[PDB]
Structures are given as C-alpha cells and as structure tokens.
Design an enzyme around this catalytic site. Structure first.
Site, PDB file in Angstrom:
ATOM      1  N   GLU A 193       0.873  -1.168   0.000  1.00 51.37           N
ATOM      2  CA  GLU A 193       0.000   0.000   0.000  1.00 51.37           C
ATOM      3  C   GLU A 193       0.911   1.218   0.000  1.00 51.37           C
ATOM      4  O   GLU A 193       1.688   1.413   0.940  1.00 51.37           O
ATOM      5  CB  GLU A 193      -0.932   0.012   1.217  1.00 51.37           C
ATOM      6  CG  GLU A 193      -1.669   1.348   1.437  1.00 51.37           C
ATOM      7  CD  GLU A 193      -2.001   1.627   2.902  1.00 51.37           C
ATOM      8  OE1 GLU A 193      -3.153   1.384   3.327  1.00 51.37           O
ATOM      9  OE2 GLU A 193      -1.100   2.087   3.634  1.00 51.37           O
TER      10      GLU A 193
ATOM     11  N   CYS B 198      -3.304   7.316   4.765  1.00 47.86           N
ATOM     12  CA  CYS B 198      -3.260   6.935   3.356  1.00 47.86           C
ATOM     13  C   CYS B 198      -4.581   7.204   2.644  1.00 47.86           C
ATOM     14  O   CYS B 198      -4.583   7.510   1.446  1.00 47.86           O
ATOM     15  CB  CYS B 198      -2.886   5.456   3.225  1.00 47.86           C
ATOM     16  SG  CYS B 198      -4.006   4.317   4.106  1.00 47.86           S
TER      17      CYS B 198
END
Lengths: 482, 482, 483, 475
Positions: free
Chosen positions: A253, A287
């Site tokens: 990620e 994120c």
C-alpha cells in the site's frame, strides 16, 4: 476521526524467540518535545540474517502446526496485548506524539486482527472442482507459502503491524517485521509480549535498522517468499527491484491522492464532519484521507465556512491527560515538505484561510490545521500527496468534468463522494478509478478489504482477502479409473 | 492424449489495429530440416512503443465496452481461428517441427480459452460485504486493471498465447504480446485474424524482436499494469527488476522439476503409459512433465522394462503427411544443453539404457528418446530441468525418504504419485510441496487451475482464477444514516 | 606515491539542465567505517534521467560549435572552483567511503590534472593533410565532437573516475551525463554544485544517481548517447553493451583485472616489497591495477615473505581525518564477505594464512585486516577471481618460462608487474605478458600516461591524448583539383 | 557449373548442406557452395583461436611475405575471381575490376604498412620512469560481408587482419559467396598456415549468431544494414569484443547555383548508376538550386539515357540488375510511394521490356520532398531523387536531417560556399566537386552509419592493441 471502527523504555531485538542486544543503539526522539523518550537495540545486517534464518528454520514445524493450534497462539498473544494495553499505547504516544485517544486505533486493531484471522483460519475449507469429462477428481486446497517479511510505515505503528501479523500467524508463515526506525518502540514491545508468552522461536521476529543496509538485506535475501510493504511509492519500486534475487510475491500500500467530491445536494454538515475528521486525525498522515477536496460552486462559501469552524476547534498539542485531537508531524523533513506545498500553492494563487505555519511559542514539528482555497490542478499540492493537516479546496461546476479531474492522478487508494442524488452517487461510484469509493461517509474495519489500485500498490489488507498473500493453492487431481 | 491437455510465409506486425512492416525481418528456421520456412517483420523499440501507446489509448473504450460485447468479439475471433485451423497448425508445425497431432494442443487451447473466458466474464457478479456495526453498506466489484503485456515461451506458441489472450480480452485489458523470436509465425497469424475481423485498434498487439531491446522496452515502460511471462527463472528475475520503473502486477510460470513417484503397489502399465506419454510429447518440452522418476526397488526391473518398450516404439521425424510421434528439440542450444546433462550423468554413475544421441543419418536437432538409470541427487540432470526427451530414473526404498528427495528442489510446478494405497496417496498429496499433485494419472484443461509455487513463479493460468491478474477490486461503501 | 598516481555534506540535489533540482526520492549515504549516515542525495528516476539526456542533447549543437579556446576557458573556470572547494570535495570522498585523508588527494588532484591536461590538449588539435597518390584530389582530415556522452562511474575512486571522463568530454564538446555509484555519489554531486555556481551552460554536464535496473538501463537504452563509457565489473560491462543496442553507440570500459606480479631470483627485494605492499594496501587494495597474484621465485621466497610481513604489520588501519591512517575499510558488507570467502577458500585448499584474514578486534565497520597468504595455487578462487581487497596472495615459482604461462593464464588484461635486475629477463616478460601495462621494477600512472586494458578487461584508453579518441569523430574533406 | 568447398583449418572441406547460387539477371543456377552449419562455424572459430599464438608471434616481415604470396596467386587468377563476381551477382565485367583491384591493393598497402610500425616513447614529466608504447595483435577477428562488393568488402578486412596477425573468420553473404570461396582455394593452394584465414557461408540466424555469440572473437566487424549492426552488437555481448561497422547511408548531394553542372551531373550519375546504385557512399538525396534546376535535370536525363543495361561479359555493360527480388520490390515501392505523394517520374521506374531478370531501369525522380519515404530511407538502387532548394542555410538543415553519417556531396565554385558546407555537414566524408576513394584514404561513417575506419592506416586500429611498458629508472 479515522473512521476505523473497532469490532522499560529500553528495548532489545526479538529474534529467534529471544530478546538480544546488538552492536548499536538507536535513540528515539519525540517529535513534539524533541526529547529522548527511549532507545532500542539497533539491528545490523548480521541481525537481519539471523532473523531470516530463524524464520526459515521455523517454517517446517510452524506451517504444519494445525490451524486450531496456531489460532490458540494468536489468542494467547491477544490476551497479553489486552493485559498490556496501557504500555503499548504509551509506546506509540511517546515515539510519535500521537494523542492518547488516537492511540486506541493502533492498539484495538491489533486485538481485532488477532481475533479475526484466528477465527478465519479455522474456517478454511477445501474446494472441489468439476471435471468436465468425468475422468478425474479435483480438490483445491491452500497451504502456507513460506517466510514473510513486512516493512511498516510510522503513521500507524501497531495498526500496520496488525495488518501483517494477523494473517501471517494464522497462515503459518514465519514473519520478519521491520518497524520504521522512527516508531520502533511499540513493535519491540509486542516482541517482548511474544517472548513473555513463549511463542515458538522464529515464528515472529521484530528488528529495526537502517533502510539501505537492513532493509535491502531483507529484500535481497532469497529466504522470503513474500515481501509486504506500507510506505512510499518510490520505496515500493526499490523493494521490487531489490527483491528480484529470487521469485517473491509482492504486496504493498503506497501513496495516495484521494479526491473528495462535495455536490450541491450533499449533507454539508456531514461532509464537513467526515472530511475534517479524517484530515486532522493523525495530523492528516493517513493513506485514505482526502488530498483534493472538490466542492460545487453553489455551496462553496457555506462549505468553506463549515470547514473553518471545525478546523479552528481542533485541539493541537501533546498531553495524554487532555482532549488533544491532533499532534505534530513525524519529523523535520515532513514539516518542510508540507510547508513547501502550502507556500508554493500561495505563490501560484491559492488563498490561505487558516494555518499555514507552526504554532507560535513551540519548537516541535507542529503544523497548524490549514485550509487552502482557490487551488487548481497545476499546483504541486494538487499533484502530490500532502500527508499532512492541510485541507485544499478546488471549486467545480460540472459533474462530468470533476470526475475527469478526480481521476487525473496515478494514485488509486480511496475516494469520496458526498451527494443526495442516486444517479450522481451511482455515476461517480462506477467511474472513479480508485480502490475504495466512500459515499457520504468513511468506514474501515478488520473485516472490510482495504487496498489500492494503479500506482497505490498491490494486494489487500483486512478481510479474508488478506490471507491470499500468505496462502498458496494446491490442486490434487486423481484418475478415477486408477 | 499423451501430453495431458484435455480439449473441451511473410507476416507483418499487428500494431494498433493495422498490419505494418518495419526496417528489418527475421528468418524462421525449421529445427528438423534447418531450412528457412518463413519470415516476419522484426520490431524495434519504436514499434514496441507504438504497441504500448496504442494499447494505452484503447483502455478507456475497451474497458468500458460491455462484457457481453467484449465476449462477442472473443467469439468472432474464435470463429476465424476455427476457420483457419489448418494454416494455424501449419505455422506451429513449421516453426517448431511439431508432429501434426501435437499442434492440436496449440490450436484447441486457443478455441477453448476464448470460449471459457467469454462465458466466464458475463457471469461475474458483485459481492455484498456485511457491516458488523450496521452503519454502512458494502459492495465489492471487479474492474479492468489496465494494459497487459505477455512474453510467451516457444514450447507451445499458441497454447501459451491462449492462456493470456482469453483472460485479457474478457477482462477488458488491451494486450501487448511478444512471442518468442524462435516461434513467432503462429502468433503473427493470429494477429492477421484479429485485423481480418476488424478488432478495435490496440486491443491486441503482436510483435517480435530482441530481448535486450524490445523485451526490455516493454518491461521498463510505465504503461503496462500487468507483466506476465512464460519462460526461465533468470528471465523472470530480470523482468521483475526491469519492470520496477512502475508498480506492476507480475504473473509468471518458470522452471519445473517434477518428481514422479512409482510405488510398490502401483499400476505399472498405467504409470509407464502416463510418464512415457508426457515425456515424449513435444519432445519433453513441457513445463509439467516429470523430471525425476522415482521407482520402488521391488518393481524397478519390471517398470524399467515397460519404459524401454514404450521408448523404443516412439517414431521420430518431421513430416506433416506422415504419422510421427516425436519431433526434434527447439535449437542447437537446447540440444547441447540436454546432451551435456546426459553425458554428465554417465560420468557420475548413471547407466545409459537407450538413446543419448542424435538418430542416425539426420541433420536436424533430433534427440532420441533417452532412458537413464542409476541417477542420484548429485547429478546436474537431477538438479536442473531437462526440458527434453530423457527419462531419468532413481530407485528408492522408503516412501518417507523419497518424499524428502521429491521435495529437494526449489521448483514448485507439477508432481506425480502412482499408488493403489489410499494412505500412501493421502500422505504424498498432503506433504508434496508442489502446486499440482497428479495421482495415478495426469489431467490439465481450460477449467482446471494451472499454477506453480516456490521459484516456479506466481499466478494461475486456466480456470476462473486466471482472471484475477486482469481484474482489480473495488469496494463501494455508503453510510446508511446518510 | 603508494597508489602510484603521480600528481601533476548534508544534502545535495541533482544537477540537470544547469539547475539544482530535487526529486520524489532520496538516498542515504552510510560511512563504511562508522556505519552512520553521513549524507543525503536527491535520487533520480527515469524521468530525471531522461531530463538529463534531453538537456544534454539540446546543448550539443551549441556546445559542440563553441570554440575550443572558449570550452577550455569553462574547464579552467570549473578547475578554479574545484581548487577553491578542495576541502569540501575531499571531505565528501572521506565521508562516502572512509578513505584516509591523504588518499583523498588522488581523487581531488586527478580532477584538477584532467581539467588542465585536456583544456591544453584540445587547443593544440590540428588538421592532417592526406596525400593523394594520383594527384587528382586534396584531402583534409579533421576531428569534431561526436555527440552526447554518458559515463557510469565506479565507487573505488569517485572523483578520479569522474576526472577520466569529465576532462575529455568537456574539451571535445560532448555534453556529458554522469551516473556516479549510488554508494559514493556525494563527491560528484558536489562537482555539480560547482558547475551550477560558475554558470556552466545548461546540459553540458549532468550528474544524477539512481537504481541500476531502472536509471542505469534507461541511460544505456536511450538512443541519445553516442558514447557509453563505464568503469565497473565485467558482468555489468556485457549488460551495458546489450542494453545499448537500441542504437549504434561507441563503447569504452575498464573492467576487472587480475594483475600478475613476478618477483624473480635477482630482484631488488626491498623495492619489490615496497611497491607491491604500497599498492596492495592503498585504498584497501580496491585498485584496478594492483597485483592480484604475486609470483615469487623459490630462492628468494622466504626473504621476500618476511619483508612483506614486516610492511603489512606496520599498516595503520582506521578512520579519522585527524589521525595518521594508512588504510580504511572496504566499501560494504558484500565486498567484505566476498573477500573473506576468497581467503577462507584458499585456506580450505591448502593456503597458509600468514597474517590478517579477519576484521580487526573490537571495531564496527567493514574493516579487513592487511592479509598475507602463501602456498596459493592456480586451482583457488583467489587465484582465478579479482581480490579487490587488502590481500597479498603469494605463489612460489621456479621456472621463468612456466611462470610466464601462469601469469598469462587469465582473461584479464589490465596491469602486470615484473621485478628483476636481468635485462634479458625484463625484455622477455615485457614482450610476452599479455596485458595492457607492464610495470618494470616499480609502478607509475599519470594524467599524461595512457591507462588501458586488453582482453576481457575492457576497450578504450583513459588518460593521455588517446582518451580524446572516444569523444571525437573523424571527417575527411576531399576536393577535386581539376575545378 | 562450379562446386566450391569450405576453407576451414587449412583444409577444403565439405558439409552436409549446400547452397545454390542463382544469377540475378538470368535467374539460372551458376554454381554451388558447401553451406556451413553451426559445427563448421565452431570449427573455424576454434581453428583461428588455435593459430593465434603462432600467427601473432610470426614476424611482421614474415606475415607480409604470406600476404604477397596470396597477392601473387590472386593476380594469376584474376579472370576466375572476376568471373565468380560476374556470375554470383551479374555485376558487369568492367565493374568487377573494382572488386579484384581492391583485393590486390589492400594486400599491398597493409603488407608494407605493418613492417613500418614503430614503437613510440612517452615522456615522463617527473623523470622517474621510462615509457614505451607498442602495438600487438588483439586476437581472433570475425567479418560479416555484404553482397554489393564481394571481394572489395573482403579486401577491407583480410588485409589489416593478416598484417596485424589476427586469425580471421570470414562470413561472405550467402547471396555472393563464390568469389570469396575462390580466395579460400588460393589460400589452400599457397599453403597458408591453418586457421589464419577461414571462409564459410551459412544461415544468418544460426551461423551468424554462433560467430557473434562465441567468446573466441576479440573483434566483430560488419558491412551491412543498421538493423543487422544493432543485432550483432547485442548478440556479441556474451563477451567483451571490439566492434567496427559500416552501415546504411543517406548521402546528400547539394548542387548549388554556381556549380559546374556538367561535372556535377557526371559524378552524381556515374556513382548512382555503377553497381546499380548499390553503393554505401552513393547520393541518396540530390538537392539542386532553382537557378540551375531544369538545366541540371536535363543533363542528368542525358547521361541516364546512355546507361547500357544488361548482362554480357563481352559487352561494355554499364549496369546490371539489383541483387534479388526483395531489393527490386523495395526500390519499386519507394518510387511509387513518392509518385503517390507528388513526385514527377521522368525516367525509368520499371523493369526493362521483356527481361524477367531483377533489372531496374535507370530512374530519375523530381519534385521529391522531405515527406516521402524515398527521402528518409536509403534507396540503394539506380534511382536519382531530386529536391529543389533555394537557400543554402535551409538545405544544409535538410541535408543533416538524417541519422546517417557516411558520405556527402557539395558542388559549388564559391570558396565560401565550399568552406561553409564542408564544416557544417555532419557526415564522415564530404566530397567537394567530385568523388574519390582509395586504399590509402580513410573510409568511415559517424552517427548511425557505424564505427571504425576502413582503408588507410586507421583500419589497423581495430586489429592492434596498445601496450605501455613502464620501468623505474632508479631500479
């Protein structure tokens, strides 16, 4: 908030089921007070090789340990995590000046993942596949893949660990964990808990060190079957190329650039609560937080006013006994990088409505809740990931044009749409090229898949899909006529 | 059915929906007659970049083309493939000197894959995910990933294409295909069929060229979202490193080292038929064919006698109007590599029972059906992939000992167990560290997953799982309280 | 002159297109003695590499047409900035690879010497008339800038390796793209800062560091460079040639070496030990021309070995610019383990470890002690492979004709050494040694002396006038005399 | 009518395969050669390697003696050598003299040059050392020859390689292998030591790649297409090798306003029609100023009409056919693509009446511009493509608008126009008011046209390696 809905300051390395020292130490500095809060035994290349060889030696017995017994180990570690909640959250509080309430996310996700994947692994069943010719039988099964290594980012030290530790233990993959050197205390504390409960040697290994030596040595090793990373897109490319000494499964990620679209029929109070909540939680170092906030021209002034009200009410500081909403950013490089994006925006026409500087009378890496308007697609704060407490607002008028603007990025993590129209919600949900589309809110949990597409990474965190990286298929095909 | 696949000339570059020439050509040499049998227009880096840019421009229209409509294109292409069966099988016959019956694997897999994935994609359904708190709803869907690029091995020029073309077309990913420069004619013929049916530009691209320039340009490009490769583990690792200019999905099938275990209670006739069948099919150039044949000492003399009888009946040659069992190997490099493995085994104690040489009075790269006994773990033929018509036999005594020998490899493709004992079968099926365990036979088909573990690569070919590489998830989560 | 080269940093940005720029990435620099971070560079991606190639291409027409006098003026303006920043440049080399302070002078001084040598050489280039045997035409042979040049530099001499390519390329009007080793990029990034300071024309010099499989391959595979030059290993040499085949390019490289050093029965043993020990421990033996196989005659074996052990024991090992240090550590852990495997392999096959063969006691970094091995034979890895470390590997011989065959028993072809007092013996070995350089009773390298290898050690020449040949293309103008 | 064997290891040997040679004018079989396979290529490479230690240590005076002995046999067999060329590619008899004569010139030029090579002393600035710079043989050389000049292309490599003591492996083009096989027979007749010269033809993908990918050759040299050059570079990367190549050209010929138009038309038409324009240095784009356009086009039309085309050893034939059907079709599609975009075909552009051979008539095109493929790509045929210009600075930009860098042509009587073009033309050779090539004049290209030099003393550079011997004066 983060919308993650739940379901002895000197520490040594945890390698091979033992707590050991090394030739070097690392002092950990609190980003708010700039004072030393602890120290860890720092790993070198020799310690990285020890952890890798210990994980490899454990694979044969750990991967053949029955799933119900591996789950028992996970719940014994869970019980120790629960018994040591205060110290675990104090470790995250000290290493990165995360507010005390915000530390609950890190701690609770660790408990949730241990529970989720211990329960999921005992429910894995074989699958029969039909033979179209009737000549053979076919059974599809899943087995542990090998040694896994995890590189963790600093923004959520225990939550990031939870995303990898849960599936690896459940799937019988000995794990080598490298926490970020900026936030190692909380992970080392988990290693102390593994030693306390007597986890089999090699099953979990925790070590921190320098990236270009310890990190590369883990990636370039031929031992790991899986390399998983949470971090920057450039580090993801470095790990892929460096790990090419053998065939490895990659899952990561990486960076995001989330567009948030507030239409004219949107519940403005709800859209403001959701956006400001996640833009100032963890100081925007999230994120999935919005990076570009698109607002319709007809509701622009009223929405900006609602955003400023919430931004001014954010409690900023570092005090576990106060209702602090937001702390500082991680380090000096993060501060100046954020400040460069904010100042470049102003120099190109953006209007600063709040913040844009450090609070006066403080020396830590604090950055005030910032609101920027009149932002356009040519600015650097538009192109790049802010990863900070900055709300950047772009005015739109045409739904078809703002969709193209929202997709005008290589990122592919999260995205947001705030609207009351069903055709509008359906339109953006289908055409947004992002892994997640959050409609009129935001929701993450251990059972919901979290993932990015495009240049935001490979693989899935949380949900049953997270086991995919740690389990390999097997097809047994037998002739029926023997 | 020896190869186990169970069914269900001047050519130009096909780039951007058009057939084009370049500044160079590549001659194609038949490995049996050593004569020129065709020519193709050779691609440079400029042609490689054209295919990449044309596939990129096509992604918007092709990915949003309805799945029912994309399936209609796949069936239209299938109709042209069926109508050109002779010419397509002639191209494989000429470029590879494959016996005429063995070109049916290449041809029929292309039809089978277009059928299987046109049907699979229209039955893809969304997935509801339960919210444990009852505050949101969750819908998990699948979307096209982006441009895909495929590097194909020469052993099955059209079957290898089939494994990538079917899934990529169905999943709405424009495909850039680089067939091996040794066997490009059959793939270039598929490009002509694509142009003939009016396939939209960029959806499929076929081009062949040097690995150091054209292959690297494709891997290093930032356009591909998926890189897939059938080839060697060294090219595999090279593709991973050179592809690290962007975040890419990697799918690979690499080297194999299949153990075939013939136990004391085995059907010796059935075991000899299966092993010999796939060992001499395609001259043993099959990723799943056994590499090390373990035989129990109590039935070793009988089994070796049955193997030699079958190996002596193999008819070797090259002629489309004759009945021929086995053709030659691909080129001189392959011939010498195979021959060095045989001679090295003889120098270390292996007994040459049959073959081990080129047949008399022929000039092509023919290698006789070869049988070696008294092989041990120290020989190169034990450690490395033969990829040739050589049966290498090891005698064992203990089932628990031969399991460790079978697993004494970094390969992870296919494996074989021949036994009439249910406990012996279950023991090997569980403990064999391979992606496929074939019990008392061998079976592969378009609906059955084909995959390898460990250093044999990552990803799945055939079955519904082959779509995973070309489909990206999306979670749409909506706040129900609004 | 132990190295035989006779003379005549917190954060640094990329120098591309005449500007100092940042990137999305960043590479940390670790000192191999202290294992601490000492510096930081903006790491290049393929976008930055293509920016450098394109800016260098755009500058070629303007830079190649700049008069040779004016180009040499820019070379001297850079040279003046180099001298004015000598302290920082040597501290950069000291920090990035723990080189002893006096050893950093080889890097700095060669940068000054090369800027001087090629600024003076280019202004003395004259046309050459070619005679027509039939009296029908005139012929003028001249030399012109060839195009854009790209250089891949090794870590063992970060500024000296830069010097070998920067001098000729600037003088010959070839815009240069330099890729320093990511292990030692600090010193070269500092030269890029100097270029920006003096206002060097944009694109003429570009300095960037990044990953090899991405940034390095993007430079070689580019169709812009006309010349690719490399100082590195034989394996990356073959990789660059294949990767550069996207267009027609000139290649020049210096690769691995395997120098034989033959000490005969009549040699000055004190002189031979001083020369061999000096260059074997300078830069921790990480020198392309240092002896790899020391052949010593039977009659002088014991006396020469004792002289070698006496010198090797006196080598002062450490890391401190304010102490007297002879030898620092090797570059990284990979080199340390690679060297250690060669020493242990020799021991396992019968060699006798006379001294060293280990890290010094109670120290942290990648230090390898000065090592002496005897009873080495041609079957050992240490005989077949390049040591590139502080290990003296001694083989005893008896016949001059046999040791000649042994010395030539390698695909390397860089340097070689012969120590003897016999004039016939000197002529015999100098004629029959298949190496680019034969050093007799000493060792000597300088900016004016050609340095080159043959066989699998590489192609092209560094230093001397010949180094210009890779950056200059010929032109023949022929005119019919009969109007 | 003739059967020629492989010359490998000092022996004339046969193989399992054969190749028939077909004359491109009569389409009849004129001979055959023993075709080499991979095993024969390994045999030649290993025999050349085996000979290196004795041949490279053979004195240069003695090596030159072997070159002159081969020269004597070549002179004695001039008729047969030129007959092979005449038969394998239908080259006119007069034109075959360039192939044979360059073979004798190269043997003479390099046998004399090698015996005059002298060591060079290098000055030591510090006076502490002495330095001697010498040159030695590099190793085994391999040469891939084009078909346009079978013996001249061989001459460029055989002379320097023999003189420099490099054993040589020669792969003539399979389209024109007879003349070079004949040289091999002469090498066997004079008793040349085994491995010094090896001659073999075979499949490009198998035999050619086996030579490049072998680790034995120290030098890979090639005369051919740019794409083949890039293929050889990458394929030869299995080891470190020296590369020297002469590839494709796109020579601009600039006919200014003050030019001698009679002389410009003679030079341009002469080299554009010799060897059917299949010449690396022939003008590819002819730039003519407006003031002299129609006068120059008329003079070009006159000489192009006088070209005697045919195939007859006893007739004064000026121009034969092109090499094969691929070349004919490639040239024809360049002319018809130019016509389809506005080029005015004035002469030729077709096969002559009732010939059936690969003949292409002398062709003259006008109204050609930079858009056309015939402008960008190398014609390599008997086609004159004329482009009209007006300004000198503009046509110089057009002349350099190519990645080729072989030859170039400037026709002018102004001394400042001559110096302006001779300086700014980015080509290896600038021919002013004429054209001249000889064994002593360097022949080379820059940019994408290759690396290294053929002819002159610089051709020895690819076959000789330097050595610096440095000695301490104080002992």
């Amino acid at each position: 908030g983060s919308s993650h809905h739940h379901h002895s300051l000197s520490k040594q390395l945890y390698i091979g089921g033992k707590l050991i020292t090394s030739d070097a130490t690392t002092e950990i500095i609190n980003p708010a007070t700039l004072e030393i809060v602890g120290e860890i035994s720092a790993a070198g290349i020799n310690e990285a090789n020890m952890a890798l060889e210990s994980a490899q030696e454990a694979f044969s017995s750990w991967s053949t340990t029955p799933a119900i017994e591996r789950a028992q180990w996970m719940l014994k570690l869970r019980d120790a995590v629960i018994a040591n909640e205060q110290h675990l959250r104090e470790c995250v509080h000290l290493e990165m000046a995360k507010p005390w309430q915000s530390t609950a996310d890190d701690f609770q996700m660790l408990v949730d993942s241990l529970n989720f994947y211990a329960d999921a692994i005992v429910n894995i069943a074989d699958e029969e596949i039909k033979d179209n010719e009737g000549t053979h039988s076919h059974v599809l099964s899943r087995e542990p893949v090998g040694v896994a290594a995890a590189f963790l980012a600093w923004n959520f030290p225990l939550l990031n660990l939870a995303y990898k530790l849960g599936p690896a233990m459940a799937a019988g993959c000995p794990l080598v964990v490298k926490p970020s050197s900026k936030t190692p205390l909380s992970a080392y504390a988990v290693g102390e808990l593994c030693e306390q409960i007597g986890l089999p040697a090699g099953v979990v290994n925790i070590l921190s060190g320098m990236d270009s030596t310890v990190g590369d040595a883990i990636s370039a090793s031929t031992i790991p079957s899986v390399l998983t990373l949470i971090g920057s897109t450039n580090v993801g490319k470095h790990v892929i190329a460096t790990g090419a000494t053998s065939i490895k499964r990659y899952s990561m990620e990486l960076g995001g650039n989330a567009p948030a679209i507030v239409c004219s029929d949107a519940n403005l109070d709800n859209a403001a609560d959701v956006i400001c909540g996640v833009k100032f939680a963890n100081a925007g170092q999230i994120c999935v937080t919005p990076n570009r906030v698109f607002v319709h021209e007809s509701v622009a002034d009223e929405f900006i006013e609602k955003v400023l009200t919430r931004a001014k009410a954010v409690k900023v500081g570092f005090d576990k006994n106060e209702a602090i909403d937001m702390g500082p950013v991680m380090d000096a490089n993060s501060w100046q990088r954020i400040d460069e994006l904010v100042k470049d925006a102003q120099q190109n026409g953006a209007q600063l409505q709040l913040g844009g500087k450090k609070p006066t009378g403080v020396n830590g890496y604090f950055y005030e809740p910032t609101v920027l308007t009149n932002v356009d697609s040519s600015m650097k704060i538009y192109k790049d990931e802010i990863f900070g407490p900055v709300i950047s607002i772009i005015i739109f008028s045409d739904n078809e044009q703002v969709l193209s603007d929202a997709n005008d990025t290589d990122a592919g993590l999260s995205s947001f749409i705030f609207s009351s129209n069903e055709d509008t919600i359906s339109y953006f949900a289908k055409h947004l090229r992002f892994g997640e589309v959050q409609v009129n809110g935001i929701k993450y949990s251990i059972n919901l898949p979290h993932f990015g597409i495009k240049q935001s990474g490979v693989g899935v965190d949380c949900s049953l899909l997270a086991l995919d990286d740690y389990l390999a298929y097997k097809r047994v095909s037998r002739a029926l006529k023997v």
